[PDB]
Amino acid sequence: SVAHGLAWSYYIGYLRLILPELQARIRTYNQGAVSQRLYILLPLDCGVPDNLSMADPNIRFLDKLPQQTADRAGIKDRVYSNSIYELLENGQRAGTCVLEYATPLQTLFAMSQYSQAGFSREDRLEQAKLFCQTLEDILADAPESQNNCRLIAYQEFSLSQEVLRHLRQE
Amino acid sequence: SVAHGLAWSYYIGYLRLILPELQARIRTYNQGAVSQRLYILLPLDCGVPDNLSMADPNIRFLDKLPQQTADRAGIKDRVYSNSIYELLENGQRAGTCVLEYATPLQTLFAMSQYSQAGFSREDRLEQAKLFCQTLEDILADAPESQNNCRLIAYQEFSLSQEVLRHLRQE
Numbered sequence: 001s002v003a004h005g006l007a008w009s010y011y012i013g014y015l016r017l018i019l020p021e022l023q024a025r026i027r028t029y030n031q032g033a034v035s036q037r038l039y040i041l042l043p044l045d046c047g048v049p050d051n052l053s054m055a056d057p058n059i060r061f062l063d064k065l066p067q068q069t070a071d072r073a074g075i076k077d078r079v080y081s082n083s084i085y086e087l088l089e090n091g092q093r094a095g096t097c098v099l100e101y102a103t104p105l106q107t108l109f110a111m112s113q114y115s116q117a118g119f120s121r122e123d124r125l126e127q128a129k130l131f132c133q134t135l136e137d138i139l140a141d142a143p144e145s146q147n148n149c150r151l152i153a154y155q156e157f158s159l160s161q162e163v164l165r166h167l168r169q170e
Numbered sequence: 171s172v173a174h175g176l177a178w179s180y181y182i183g184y185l186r187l188i189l190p191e192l193q194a195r196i197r198t199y200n201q202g203a204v205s206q207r208l209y210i211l212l213p214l215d216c217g218v219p220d221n222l223s224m225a226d227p228n229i230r231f232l233d234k235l236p237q238q239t240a241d242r243a244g245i246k247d248r249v250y251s252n253s254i255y256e257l258l259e260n261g262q263r264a265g266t267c268v269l270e271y272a273t274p275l276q277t278l279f280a281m282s283q284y285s286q287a288g289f290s291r292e293d294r295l296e297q298a299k300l301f302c303q304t305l306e307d308i309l310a311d312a313p314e315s316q317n318n319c320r321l322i323a324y325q326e327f328s329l330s331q332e333v334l335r336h337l338r339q340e
């Protein structure tokens with residue numbers, strides 16, 4: 001399956017490389033009490049906007065974490081950057097975390113729109129479900145995941161309330 | 171198929187975003203004489219080193235192109251960087267280009283090594299072939315590709331000679 005490959009791609013070329021160095025990057029930034037995990041937004045509708053504040057105005061960009069750099073596949077100093085968001089609830093800052101959407105969900109979205117990609121617009125939801133299921137299975141038994149990462153899967157609503165529910169569990 | 175999804179992912183979340191802005195970045199750097207296309211290395215063995223000079227000492231890093239920046243899926247100022255290499259032939263600089271390996275080939279490589287990933291070590295070569303075939307089909311009919319991109323697919327040997335052969339065609 002394409003979803004299965006994308007979930008494996010997402011772990012191999014991203015999660016596996018950034019999750020081990022994430023603690024040191026948040027500690028560096030702290031030294032506005034940002035949480036220690038990467039919160040990954042997984043909309044099952046594959047609706048992935050580039051600006052989180054457009055999805056919910058109660059999610060507001062605060063700052064970027066110090067950039068991660070690595071030589072990768074002929075690219076000298078490839079950059080991995082993560083953004084810090086503050087979550088508002090009735091005019092109050094209720095949480096602060098490293099938040100982003102899972103980017104492969106934009107591939108599933110674009111593949112369902114292009115005729116030569118071979119999967120209908122109808123198939124988007126089950127591909128998104130298989131992607132979340134594969135990613136949860138990978139992170140269940142992955143070493144780089146040590147209470148380091150949280151997946152927020154959802155079907156449409158308040159996005160900031162959805163994130164806060166997961167944040168309040170810790 | 172996994173390869174098919176990875177080729178679509180490679181075009182949607184990368185080629186489609188960097189190919190239209192590539193000319194303007196090479197022109198800026200040229201203000202030597204770097205070629206106008208992105209040369210994409212596609213080893214069918216999925217052998218993707220992080221340093222190009224280790225694959226062939228006749229391929230030597232020169233400089234980075236001005237970074238490309240975009241807000242993407244909740245990541246403010248996500249960075250896309252490309253490296254400029256010089257190709258040597260008997261102690262002479264024979265070519266200068268923006269060169270890199272296709273990164274999904276590291277996913278196919280890692281998936282053939284992990285038991286929960288679904289395809290064996292045996293399947294690596296045909297997945298790499300399907301990936302190249304899908305990517306060639308995508309770039310045949312893609313608008314962003316306007317004598318902008320060159321795929322260098324190969325089975326093992328001199329890598330710099332393989333790149334120079336493609337460079338000398340233009």
Ligand SMILES: Nc1nc(=O)c2ncn([C@@H]3O[C@@H]4COP(=O)(O)O[C@H]5[C@@H](O)[C@H](n6cnc7c(N)ncnc76)O[C@@H]5COP(=O)(O)O[C@@H]3[C@@H]4O)c2[nH]1
Nearest residue numbers: 009010013014079080081103104179180183184250273274
């Ligand atoms: N050569 C190269 N240079 C790049 O800068 C780059 N950026 C993406 N890609 C490849 O394009 C395709 C589409 O990208 P997508 O965002 O959907 O997936 C990405 C994305 O979900 C995540 N990821 C990797 N690097 C970053 C990053 N810097 N910021 C956010 N997410 C990232 O992990 C997936 C796999 O990454 P790569 O394994 O490097 O391969 C991707 C993929 O094949 C790149 N390929």
